[PDB]
Subunit: 335 residues, 4 copies
């Protein structure tokens, strides 16, 4: 049956993220549903929230890569039934604004500060109350919870960005960072037919980037590669040093995608951006529609997320390891 | 008759901009044509180059807003003939690469730095040798040399940016700076149907902005105006302070156009740009096709450039005035 | 107060459109609301349903240009309150599908056959039950019901089409038909900044087109006009003769918009369409977001719908006049 | 050495396509070059010209899929050298109009009726005079002349259309016709990552379609496939019946690409195109930039044109087999 209480990690600004053993298990009201978390991923963004002032709100269960099984549905829920395996659409769009009707519910202003695991409660618990079921994607039968969870951000974000940049078979792109996101960016990009060059400061990540399909992998681009030669540069790190590499190597009218959140601000050379018409396109998570596209690509085997799983109570240990860039790929937790 | 020597203003990194009374006038070889300058405009970019280290080559006659009359055509040229009134397409693209064949001849790599008045010789002289006649647009009979001169940049640049921003009747835009480019941007934007709000530190510029069609003008945007409510923000100043205004007032997925070149670098808030998918689009001058459109808009009266003229030998006195923001609109010179 | 029974014109396949005196006044369930019709427009499409046997469904109150005031809201409805003046979004999207969330709720497969007044009940009655209020747009205070009504189709449709064609100040377009939609297409197009040439076989319509802002109006295009010289051709008639005019005068890569529905099938010259890459884009009504864009353009005075009002009971007399192209612009009715 | 006379096939409205053993060998004038034809392909289009009067001009050497080696260069030709292996860009744009500058040199008006082998002389000869060298693309060393010839149209045309339709990894497309163009369209579509369904009346073609990578291949779509379920429908046949299939199976807002020229006219159901906003996009050959993209994709092994070669003098025989749809893929000839 479904318990009266549960354990989970709650984030509070004065105490950080804390394990709580006596959390309530909400019973879904009309239009809501209860999701039993099967897998929740750890995104590097949680590190920015907890340790670097990335402000998303206060006192909420973290964990935004959520995959679970419908455990209970409130009155009026007809689209979902207990037993349905689903993954959460991070942005948690309101569903009624011009954004949520305009194919871009990821930037819904009403939902700003109310994202799953980033403002609103997330997956670092046993039972998640979903107030808006519209923000759910059905997980295909052949896709595991662990992979589905990673798919909601580690894959979704790169997919959304790559789609936005309109990558194609004539694309010659550069990806900076081959971690959780970068690793899936490689596979998504290859699916679009692009040539992919990867940069990463960690040898292990570089080795993995190669196994995943990257056409070229380096720690530092050789002097032999020409500046202003890439059609698109996706920066999954976003510190000034990496942004500078993108601006140097992107071709005229090419695009720079600062997906990474490694700094509060970044500067660009104005004379260069203007005269060569470089485009800096912000990209955030992904849309409800994108998620459906994504789970389909994973299901069909085009994207295989590097995932490793562990018990949810081991989370603090893995956060520490992540802080030290001590592992490759993604790690997901089973509550 | 065509003289064998001329006067003009030559820019050198060591001696700045200097008047030369012994510049050479060369009959055009095959493929080339000699243009007699009728009007050449003074753009603020010239101030950046002469006084602020904006790197635009060395050792060439300045003046990049050029309108004139063909004085001689080399053999092989059959697209133009003596007497034709034409305006120069600044970027001076090679016309044979993938950029030039791809509707973006303004970002041609082969020709990077080979720009009229900003790398290659320009209009601050009596005769300009044009080596690539393809980079000329016919001036309509009812458009004066003075107006056509201003149109090649002051009107062309903002037209190119607005067009790139896909401005429309549903647009709510903010323009910062109502000088040479700004005043014309107001008119172009109104032609596209946008609502225009202008910011300028100088009363005279605000008044002109208003006379030209701006819906609202201010020295300081009222703090009560909702942040993130403009679909596009065109910054024709580009210093850190104005860029910050753009990022604060641009709506989600909206666009920031840093057309101005007032600083070597500009920084943007990373979390804001990413989470709200803000776009920063570099825009440079205009294309050959763009200029034809611009000259048609001007001939039709949709854009009426604010212009006043003087003898080219008065350039020094006007450079100082523009440097002190002493006049409104554009100033053009007649050699 | 709210009456128990009402009058309205119900459409049935056996007996056509007949006036009823015993129509119930539905009490809105949860999530629904009751709209008191203040103004309802007569569209030419209604004639296709009544006389050309255009199958939209059967046994429903017609009238799809709807404007009114909220008379009652069921439980749960909080986005609307009795007294709110709103206009119906014709397509009546379901809201949950990928089309409705994808910025294109006008083609929602789920709501096919359930559009206001064209499958589902409409505005040719006193009180309309609104099952899905997401399909409503608030009417600005300075916009009358009568004008709002015409805005939901007469204006909305050509707006949506014109926007799709990406018209701009460089566009040279041709519109065929200056009636309900045509007259507004003229205004919306001028707003977009395009030069507009209009064709209409009726002098009174040509006279009005000129008054509305058309740059040139004719019955037949003069020989002086070159073929393939229009960037876009909007056909609000759509019979083979008018389509032929479009394909002959549209320029290479240009677009033809068969907005009109005057024929079951139309043919195009394949050789011409392929070699000159002509585009034929289908356009249907408008989206919820389009209507907000539209009502705003009207409130701002950019579009002044030629509207004339009469009492709903006079509908029959007016349908006959429309059948005979006896009047110009739109006629809307006050219940 | 270069002979003073040659043989080739000339088309005339009166005598049809006839072999000539006394054709002159043109000496290149300045800016022009002579090309030694290494391989020329037979496109079904040639049949329409010979037998069905698609009138492209008169008295010209046919054969528009051209690959060869520069035999001679006139004075001033600098970008090309004797011995350079190049493939002709069919449309043979003028290079100086707004279309050629606007990334669409394939619809250049000045060049209408002056295309390689279709108005202007083509490849069914030994030495072709190229009056406009801009319409050449370098053949990579690892691409044979036979394959390159096929790439100038059999691959280029479908590449252009597929690029235009913006196919992607989430695309579910239908291709009708698996001949010369069809077979390559399958390969190009896969490189873009789309799911492909092919239709061909001929068994051998279906069998080849399967070997080329189509996900599903049929003679007739099984009743188990839902109408309006394809994102894009490419018709490489274009007879009323195939178009009808496209209109029935394309999903809302989907696109129909009538690339085939199997009929002088085609009709579309207006009610259906309008309500489901179906798009019909004309597509013609390819652009100079498209060919560079294509030869690169071929060189990279992503597209392997099914090609079989024969002596040019055997052309009369193969034209007959093609009329009889007797062989699969493309057949190219060696002069
Ligand atoms: N824009 C969005 O919507 C969005 C969504 C998810 C994550 N993110 C951001 O993306 C970034 C990465 O997420 P992640 O989970 O993949 O982190 P990760 O820990 O899983 O992987 C990080 C990788 O970056 C590499 N790296 C770090 N600094 C580098 C440098 N200076 N040069 C080269 N390589 C470097 C590391 O070696 C590591 O392999 C984070 O900053 C996160 O906040 C953004
Ligand atoms: N991207 C391009 O291709 C391109 C082409 C031309 C010019 N530009 C750049 O555009 C900028 C303006 O060109 P211009 O000739 O119009 O300058 P201008 O001197 O003709 O007009 C400048 C205007 O900006 C206003 N202004 C200055 N600082 C301001 C501030 N902090 N806040 C608000 N308003 C301010 C001034 O009062 C004045 O009205 C220059 O930096 C120039 O280099 C760029
Ligand atoms: N696609 C859509 O979503 C949509 C929405 C509404 C209406 N429509 C269609 O648009 C068309 C017009 O609607 P309306 O209410 O504005 O019609 P209308 O009666 O209000 O105006 C019709 C005008 O077309 C002119 N006209 C008719 N035949 C002509 C011809 N052969 N040549 C030149 N001019 C001609 C008439 O003189 C008249 O001025 C109808 O066919 C309607 O079904 C389509
Ligand atoms: N628009 C352009 O720019 C362009 C460029 C080249 C060719 N084309 C046109 O494309 C068409 C095909 O060119 P091609 O060289 O590939 O022809 P092809 O002879 O090489 O191959 C034709 C294929 O179509 C199949 N087919 C014919 N009728 C069919 C039907 N009713 N249903 C299903 N399958 C059918 C045949 O079995 C054959 O496999 C021609 O009409 C040609 O004119 C257009
Ligand atoms: Zn994340
Ligand atoms: Zn929302
Ligand atoms: Zn300038
Ligand atoms: Zn170039
Ligand atoms: Zn209607
Ligand atoms: Zn829907
Ligand atoms: Zn062909
Ligand atoms: Zn041309």
């Amino acid at each position: 049956s479904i318990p009266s209480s549960q354990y989970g990690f709650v984030f509070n600004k004065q105490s950080g993220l804390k394990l709580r053993n006596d959390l309530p298990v909400h019973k879904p009201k009309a239009g809501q549903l209860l999701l039993k978390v099967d897998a929740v991923g750890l995104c590097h963004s949680d590190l920015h929230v907890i340790y670097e002032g990335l402000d998303c709100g206060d006192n909420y269960v973290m964990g935004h890569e959520i995959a679970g099984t419908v455990a209970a549905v409130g009155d009026d829920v007809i689209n979902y039934k207990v037993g349905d395996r689903v993954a959460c659409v991070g942005p948690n769009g309101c569903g009624g604004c011009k954004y949520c009707r305009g194919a871009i519910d990821n930037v819904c202003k009403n939902a700003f500060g109310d994202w799953f695991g980033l403002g609103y409660d997330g997956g670092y618990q046993q039972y998640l109350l979903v107030t808006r079921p519209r923000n759910l994607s059905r997980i295909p039968d052949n896709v595991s919870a662990d992979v589905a969870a990673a798919s909601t951000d580690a894959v979704l974000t790169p997919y959304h960005a790559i789609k936005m940049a309109q990558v194609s078979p004539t694309s010659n792109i550069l990806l900076i960072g081959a971690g959780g996101l970068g690793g899936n960016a490689i596979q998504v990009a290859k699916a679009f037919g692009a040539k992919v060059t990867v940069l990463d400061k960690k040898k292990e990540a570089r080795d993995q980037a190669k196994k995943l399909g990257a056409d070229a992998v380096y720690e530092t681009l050789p002097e032999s590669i020409s500046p202003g030669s890439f059609s698109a540069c996706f920066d999954f790190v976003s510190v000034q040093a990496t942004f500078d590499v993108c601006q140097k190597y992107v071709e005229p009218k090419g695009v720079i995608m600062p997906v990474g959140l490694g700094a509060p601000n970044l500067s660009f050379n104005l004379g260069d951006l203007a005269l060569r018409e470089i485009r800096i396109l912000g990209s955030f998570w992904g849309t409800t529609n994108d998620l459906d596209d994504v789970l389909k690509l994973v299901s069909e085997g085009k994207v295989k997320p590097v995932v490793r799983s562990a018990k949810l109570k081991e989370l603090p240990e893995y956060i520490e390891k992540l802080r030290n860039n001590a592992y490759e790929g993604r790690v997901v937790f089973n509550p």
